[model samples]
Target: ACKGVFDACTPGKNECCPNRVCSDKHKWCKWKL
Candidate 1:
């Protein structure tokens, strides 16, 4: 999972992903975005 999303590094859930494009480098949790 993206560290940004989970930690407010981005905007919301779907946008939390650091990859932004569509990928989860760190599977911290399941992002419904």
Candidate 2:
């Protein structure tokens, strides 16, 4: 399943849910701008 905002994720993996992005700095999913 896709990860939600503030959830852990792998960068460039597209693991975050829609409208969310994987944060490289924090290594977690976050809302897109």
Candidate 3:
């Protein structure tokens, strides 16, 4: 399942939830542009 804001994620995994993007540096999901 896609990850929500503040959720942990792997870089280049594209697992962030809609309207959110994974932060490669922080390894967490954050708001998208």
TM for every model, in the order presented, reads 0.16, 0.69, 0.60
Q: Which sequence of candidate numbers ranks them by lDDT, best first?
A: 2, 3, 1
lDDT of 3 by residue, 1-33 (tens): 664579887767777776787787887889877
Which one is best on lDDT? Answer: 2
Residue 5 displacement in candidate 2 (angstroms): 1.2
Per residue, candidate 1 scores C-alpha lDDT tens digits across 1-33 of 444434433234554543543234643333455
Q: lDDT tens digits, residues 1-33, model 2?
A: 674579988877777887888888888888878
Query: How many clashes does each candidate structure show, in the order listed?
Result: 3, 0, 0
**Superposition error at 16 for model 3 (Å):** 1.5
Candidate 2: worst-modelled 10 consecutive residues by lDDT: 1-10
lDDT of 1 at 4: 42
Q: Which stretches of candidate 2 lie over 4 Å from their true place?
A: none
Misplaced by over 4 Å in model 1 are: 1-5, 12-30
lDDT for model 3 = 0.77
